[PDB]
Design a protein around this ligand. Structure first.
Ligand SMILES: [Mg+2]
Lengths: 107, 137, 133, 350, 138, 49
């Protein structure tokens, strides 16, 4: 979390967010509830990342020759046609970040 | 160990947070031939235009129905209908009848029994003889 | 305005801190014990109100929780609570026929009654913070 | 024919199209009424509210359908409901948390919300139907919305050989409610348990697409207000979602974790012993403090009911009825954020 | 001063002469209140029905409107938000929020004059395909 | 256009002449009168068949 991240979280919360339910039969707290919320946040920020992405691609041609509404507000949502959040929030990618920052040594 | 039950869902309270008018459609049938519709035809020209402009959440469908009396059929979100025959009524009587369908719900009419209807539990709980000062006979 | 008593200013936060709250509102003098989210079916057609109108109720004789109960002599001060309702519509009863008859007289006089009732929805019932007053 | 001219003019190619054209939304009285029934902002045109009623089963094109609009709205609904439960009940077990979410933003409630709006469905989709009707084909289940869960490598054995699936992994692999991922035509037939799931799914995607439309046109605050007005306004008793197994052991493990005195069951009151319907009022104490109490017609049942009520009181702890949500800080001009209470986790016992 | 006279009992089974005394006082039903000056012609009228009425000396006379307002209960509610409605004689009254106080009533022969959204207002909204919420708002 | 003797007897100004010649017959059907109205055909939530 860059300089100043150690003080960001409480003392008891630093160890909770890092402890897994498989540790000491959960006698000491685990991070199953915090992970449930953290995914909802990363899922939302990843979506907002694609909507506001200043990138435009070739539109889809309708088999029936129709023409879409072509509204600007709906153009930001049409970006999901080509880029899906799951393509960025991959297990292997996110899992690889923790190993690089030394998460495997303190978890 | 706690197992979660997945058969209970949340219930809506129309009016809390947001309101939704129950009347979603008004069918207005008239007749250019029946004499009982002389008033209905006047209601469609004089009062229906302004009444519909004031209720944009209702869908108004004006369609002729010759050989039949005029009726006001309202459709409600609950899936029921209420039709009112307005034969031999004057335009202002039609309007008073149309406001009845708007203000109404599809629920069947019921006799007055209890003012308050609640689903949330008692704030003071329900009485119990094992939670007081006891009773000596 | 008349200042609130110190005994009420001291315990009202304890009253508002408990989980649930109820109130006894008075519409035209008649009481109705309600809670946030309850539906009230008044035995009369309130004139000049259409579905969607918001009412501010300001005559409560009792505002209480499980353990504590705030009582106003005629009524509770309007500054201590905020109760609001919304007009849901107008309901009706089925037509009932009262037959007025005496013995050994054939004339059976009929009375047809079909009354309308206004329905409200209590959408707000909160106790205000009186640390300022 | 001459005596029955068409009511709504339509080109001959209308029936060939999967969904009505956008411009047709400007002549439908159902749409205009639906737009006003929800008090939507005028920034949302009728052509957009019409696109929210076309399910991917009726129109397979990425546009003209609900696919993308519903995905954005699902992310907003699930997010605002998740942060709201963790701030109102920060001690809920994970299983109860999944059911609470599914009870608010699941296909069952959203179906009731869509019906609360007066949205009728079309019998069969096509370019001739009213744009104000919900269009979908319940005979085609080959449509699925994108989510953030992954397919388990042991899913085949999970369903056949009843392999075990833990709760800690449902937060990464399963969907937002804990469910695993990836679990001519003749209309002379009756309904099916699959058509019901396809219909219930279509109504849900519509309610979600409406939220996504508000987000695209109005903004973030408008979307949160809509979710907070039609979804969070519903009522749910979370205490009824609890199902305990050996609650006397879980309570003993709770007191041991928090260092409380061992729980002792005490008979507070009784009457009718040696009868057909007695009443034993048992209360569980940890020292001198009364944790829970339960009244049943048996000594064992009254002791179990007392322990269950003691565990519910622990899990159903609420800092307040209308607590602050971390989403409130995004709205500029807000007071400083106070750290919320973070629980350790549900008790794991024998 | 005045005599505040109220009928407490009835005269059903009493002689006809007693009914005339009550008719001359103006008492037609039970608990009905009337006001008469303090004069002999009214005092003697009360000595004949003293077993039926309740009398009281009052400084002034109360009006029919002021005598009925002392039994009127408090309404107990205040309309603070009125939705759009149509008054047959006046016209269409727009939504008013008395909490922030504006009942503007618009009448006309065209839809644009009523102050409501028309099919044209919906077509111009649909053609504004360029307006977009600010990125910060999103 | 054939003008009746009853119409001519009522006509007393040049304006009455133009009116009797320009104004077409009033439509008997109510739907024809509605489509000529200025409110009902413009409301988005109203449809006339
Ligand atoms: Mg007699």
């Amino acid at each position: 979390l860059g300089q100043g991240g150690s003080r960001m979280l409480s003392e008891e919360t630093k160890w909770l967010a890092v402890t897994h339910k498989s540790f000491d039969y959960g006698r000491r707290g685990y991070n199953t509830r915090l992970a449930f919320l953290g995914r909802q946040i990363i899922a939302l920020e990843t979506t907002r990342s694609i909507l506001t992405s200043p990138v435009l691609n070739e539109p889809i041609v309708d088999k029936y020759g129709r023409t879409p509404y072509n509204h600007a507000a709906l153009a930001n949502i049409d970006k999901l046609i080509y880029t899906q959040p799951l393509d960025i929030m991959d297990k292997t990618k996110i899992a690889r970040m923790g190993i690089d920052f030394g998460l495997l040594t303190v978890m | 160990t706690v197992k979660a039950l997945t058969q209970i869902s949340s219930a809506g309270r129309n009016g809390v947070g947001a309101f939704v008018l129950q009347c979603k459609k008004l069918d207005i049938h008239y007749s250019d031939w029946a004499g009982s519709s002389r008033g209905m035809n006047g209601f469609i020209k004089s009062l229906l235009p302004k009444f519909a402009a004031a209720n944009p959440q209702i869908e108004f469908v004006v369609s002729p129905r010759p050989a039949k009396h005029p009726i006001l059929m309202g459709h409600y979100i609950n899936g029921r209908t209420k039709a009112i025959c307005v034969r031999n009524m004057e335009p202002l009587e039609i309007l008073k009848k149309a406001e009845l369908l708007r203000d109404a719900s599809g629920e069947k009419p019921q006799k007055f029994k209890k003012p308050v209807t609640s689903t949330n539990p008692s704030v003071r709980g329900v009485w119990s003889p094992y939670h007081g000062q006891g009773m000596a006979v | 305005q008349p200042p609130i008593s110190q005994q009420v200013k001291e315990l009202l936060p304890v009253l508002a801190a408990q989980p649930g709250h109820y109130t006894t509102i008075h519409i035209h003098g008649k009481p109705y014990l309600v809670t946030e989210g309850d539906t009230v079916k008044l035995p009369f057609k309130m004139p000049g109100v259409a579905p969607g109108d918001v009412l501010r109720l300001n005559r409560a004789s009792v505002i209480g929780s499980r353990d504590l109960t705030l009582q106003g002599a005629p009524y509770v001060d309007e500054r201590l609570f905020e109760c609001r309702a919304i007009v849901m519509g107008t309901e009706s009863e089925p037509m009932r026929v009262m037959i007025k008859k005496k013995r050994r007289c054939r004339k059976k006089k009929h009375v047809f009654s079909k009354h309308k009732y206004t329905v409200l929805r209590i959408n707000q019932l909160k106790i205000n913070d009186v640390s300022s007053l | 024919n001459d005596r029955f001219p068409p009511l709504e003019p339509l080109p001959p190619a209308a029936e060939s199209l999967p969904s009505p054209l956008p411009e047709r939304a400007l002549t439908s009285a159902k749409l205009a009424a639906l737009h006003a029934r929800l008090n939507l902002s005028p920034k949302i045109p009728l052509q957009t509210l019409a696109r929210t009623l076309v399910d991917a089963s009726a129109d397979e094109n990425p546009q003209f359908n609900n696919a993308n609009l519903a995905f954005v709205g699902q992310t907003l609904i699930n997010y605002h409901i998740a942060e709201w439960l963790l701030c109102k009940y920060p001690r809920l077990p994970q299983g109860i948390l999944f059911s609470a979410m599914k009870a608010y933003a699941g296909p069952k409630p959203l179906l009731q919300i869509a019906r609360s709006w007066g949205v009728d469905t079309a019998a069969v989709p096509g370019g001739e139907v009213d744009p104000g009707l919900l269009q979908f084909d319940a005979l085609k289940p080959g449509v699925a919305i994108t989510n953030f869960g992954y397919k388990r490598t042991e899913l085949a054995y999970l369903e056949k050989f009843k392999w075990r699936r833990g709760m800690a992994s449902r937060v990464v692999l399963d969907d937002d409610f804990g469910d695993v991922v990836r679990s001519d035509v003749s209309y002379d037939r009756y309904g099916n348990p699959d058509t019901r799931a396809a219909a219930e799914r279509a109504h849900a995607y519509f309610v979600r697409a409406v939220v996504g439309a508000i987000y695209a046109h109005c903004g973030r605050e408008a979307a949160k207000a809509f979710v907070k007005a039609h979804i969070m306004s519903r009522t749910l008793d979370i205490a009824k979602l609890f199902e305990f197994k050996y609650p006397t052991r879980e309570l003993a493990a709770l007191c041991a974790r928090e260092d409380f005195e061992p729980p002792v069951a005490r008979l507070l009151s009784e009457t009718g012993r040696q009868s057909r319907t007695p009443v034993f009022v048992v209360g569980i104490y940890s020292g001198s403090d009364k944790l829970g109490e339960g009244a049943a017609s048996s000594l064992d049942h009254a002791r179990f009911k007392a322990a269950m009520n003691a565990l519910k009181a622990w899990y159903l702890y609420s800092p307040g009825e209308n607590p602050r949500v971390p989403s409130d800080m995004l709205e500029e001009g807000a007071k400083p954020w106070t750290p919320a209470y973070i629980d350790m986790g549900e008790v794991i016992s024998r | 001063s005045f005599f505040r006279i109220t009928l407490h009992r009835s005269a059903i089974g009493l002689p006809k002469r007693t009914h005339g005394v009550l008719a001359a006082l103006g008492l037609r039903r039970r608990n009905q209140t009337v006001f008469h000056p303090v004069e002999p012609q009214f005092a003697g009228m009360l000595m004949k029905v003293k077993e039926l009425v309740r009398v009281e000396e009052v400084p002034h006379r109360l009006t029919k409107r002021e005598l009925k307002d002392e039994r009127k209960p408090d309404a107990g509610f205040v309309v603070e938000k009125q939705v759009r409605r149509f008054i047959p004689g006046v016209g269409v009254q727009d939504e008013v929020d008395f909490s922030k106080v504006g009942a503007v009533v618009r009448d006309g022969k065209r839809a644009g004059d009523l102050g409501v959204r028309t099919r044209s207002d919906w077509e111009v909204i649909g053609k504004m395909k360029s307006v977009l919420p600010k990125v910060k708002a999103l | 256009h054939i003008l009746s003797d009853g119409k001519l007897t009522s006509i007393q100004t040049v304006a009455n002449f133009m009116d009797a010649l320009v104004t077409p017959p009033k439509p008997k059907k109510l739907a024809e009168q509605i489509e000529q109205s200025s409110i009902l055909p413009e409301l988005p939530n109203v449809k006339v068949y």
